[PDB]
Amino acid sequence: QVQLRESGPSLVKPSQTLSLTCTASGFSLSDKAVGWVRQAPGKALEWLGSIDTGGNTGYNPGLKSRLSITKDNSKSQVSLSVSSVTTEDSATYYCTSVHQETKKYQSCPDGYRERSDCSNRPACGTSDCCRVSVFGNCLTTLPVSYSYTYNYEWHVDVWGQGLLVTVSSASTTAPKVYPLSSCSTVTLGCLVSSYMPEPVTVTWNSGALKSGVHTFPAVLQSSGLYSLSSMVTVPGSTSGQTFTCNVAHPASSTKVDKAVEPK
Amino acid sequence: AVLNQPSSVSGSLGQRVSITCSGSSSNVGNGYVSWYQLIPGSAPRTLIYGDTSRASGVPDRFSGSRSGNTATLTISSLQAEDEADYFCASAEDSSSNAVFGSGTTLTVLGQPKSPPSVTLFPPSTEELNGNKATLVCLISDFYPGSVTVVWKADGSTITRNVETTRASKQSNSKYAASSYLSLTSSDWKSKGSYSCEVTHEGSTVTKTVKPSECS
Numbered sequence: 107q108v109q110l111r112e113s114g115p116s117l118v119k120p121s122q123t124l125s126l127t128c129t130a131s132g133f134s135l136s137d138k139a140v141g142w143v144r145q146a147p148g149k150a151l152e153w154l155g156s157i158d159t160g161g162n163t164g165y166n167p168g169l170k171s172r173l174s175i176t177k178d179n180s181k182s183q184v185s186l187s188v189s190s191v192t193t194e195d196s197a198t199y200y201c202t203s204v205h206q207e208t209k210k211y212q213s214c215p216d217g218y219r220e221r222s223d224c225s226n227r228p229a230c231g232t233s234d235c236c237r238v239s240v241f242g243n244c245l246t247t248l249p250v251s252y253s254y255t256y257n258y259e260w261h262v263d264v265w266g267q268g269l270l271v272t273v274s275s276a277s278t279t280a281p282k283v284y285p286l287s288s289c290s291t292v293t294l295g296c297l298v299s300s301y302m303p304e305p306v307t308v309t310w311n312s313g314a315l316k317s318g319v320h321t322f323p324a325v326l327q328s329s330g331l332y333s334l335s336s337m338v339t340v341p342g343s344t345s346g347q348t349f350t351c352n353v354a355h356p357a358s359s360t361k362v363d364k365a366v367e368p369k
Numbered sequence: 370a371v372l373n374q375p376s377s378v379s380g381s382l383g384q385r386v387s388i389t390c391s392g393s394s395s396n397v398g399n400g401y402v403s404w405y406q407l408i409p410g411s412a413p414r415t416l417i418y419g420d421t422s423r424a425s426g427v428p429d430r431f432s433g434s435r436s437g438n439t440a441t442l443t444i445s446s447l448q449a450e451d452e453a454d455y456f457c458a459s460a461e462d463s464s465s466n467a468v469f470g471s472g473t474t475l476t477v478l479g480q481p482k483s484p485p486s487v488t489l490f491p492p493s494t495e496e497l498n499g500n501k502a503t504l505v506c507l508i509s510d511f512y513p514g515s516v517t518v519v520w521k522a523d524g525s526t527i528t529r530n531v532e533t534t535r536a537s538k539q540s541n542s543k544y545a546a547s548s549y550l551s552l553t554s555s556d557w558k559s560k561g562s563y564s565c566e567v568t569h570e571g572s573t574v575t576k577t578v579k580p581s582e583c584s
């Protein structure tokens with residue numbers, strides 16, 4: 107299937123433009139469009155827009171004035187820009203492969219009959235739909251044109267993995283990593299304090315220690331920075347061992363392996 | 370527009386559960402509704418398109434239907450892993466303009482209740498060397514997924530500089546949360562004890578740390 111990969115900044119400042127890119131690789135004759143959907147925390151999925159092979163774009167009408175979607179064939183990339191962002195634009199942004207089709211129909215409204223279905227000609231001039239009389243025959247007078255109706259089809263065929271974008275005035279900040287210890291089973295931890303943006307990764311003993319590990323989702327403090335903790339419970343039998351918390355925060359180029367000891 | 374879905378729906382295992390999605394002639398009545406399943410930590414998954422067609426890999430117990438301006442997603446035999454948010458969608462006025470439903474949270478009944486485990490960690494020496502003190506209250510293995518946390522010091526409730534996360538689902542289907550009390554090293558030393566009291570379904574589990582007796 108089509109391979110979608112979002113790229114762009116995970117952190118932008120309010121009032122700036124958020125620019126994301128998707129590389130969409132697959133069948134070169136694919137007639138799917140490439141679109142963008144987002145979901146802000148606690149909210150519904152929200153359509154942003156799409157572009158197709160013909161270069162035709164469509165947008166969420168409510169958001170259109172802030173959006174620009176373009177493509178660059180030479181890079182196999184579709185770009186999205188969201189202008190003048192606020193914290194309301196913090197969301198996971200998903201690139202998507204989208205089915206888009208329109209089917210158009212014509213019919214004669216009630217009380218009228220398609221002119222070709224009338225008998226005698228000229229049934230009602232050359233109009234589309236002749237009036238039907240009470241007796242149920244065509245009349246020549248006051249004919250109407252077809253009523254045209256369109257059926258629109260949209261669905262997401264393939265979802266990208268999404269990119270979380272946070273809009274914040276907080277600047278990129280490296281965490282301070284602290285070992286946690288309590289005052290037959292010993293519980294150890296690490297506090298990854300005051301970083302920006304998400305995410306951080308935490309493993310124990312360079313990945314060797316997985317069982318009994320609980321890494322908690324981050325809290326956002328009033329400072330505007332995140333903190334998270336990880337803890338591990340191990341048998342008191344192993345208390346003589348050396349334990350380390352491996353913390354990485356790619357955004358600030360931080361990589362720390364913190365030794366954690368029972369007090 | 371936003372399609373009208375019930376905020377929540379519940380069912381027991383093996384039961385039939387249905388989620389409605391009501392709109393207008395200009396969206397749902399257009400006759401090509403799609404449905405998506407969203408589970409935290411995963412990208413959305415397409416379930417149904419064109420009112421009734423199942424996407425690839427989607428089990429037979431999922432089916433969609435539509436009657437005029439109301440679409441319905443039916444799960445014929447509810448399974449534990451069907452717990453998720455479900456969103457309907459439809460094009461409106463154009464094939465490149467899509468409106469979503471408000472979303473429905475589907476709970477599968479019968480999960481055993483479980484009290485939280487609580488571990489309270491005091492400030493580390495290294496943090497205190499920086500004149501800061503964070504107390505970390507880690508709360509795990511609870512169900513249903515809501516707790517309230519109260520912090521105390523020498524019998525007084527603390528509200529300032531407390532931040533508590535929402536409850537998040539663990540890999541074992543129970544819930545976790547954490548609460549942070551951010552103090553100065555001076556404030557930390559100025560109290561006889563601090564407590565994190567976690568209340569869950571009417572029951573409270575309390576942990577306590579005492580600065581003068583902490584390492």
Ligand SMILES: [K+]
Nearest residue numbers: 134135136159
């Ligand atoms: K193409």
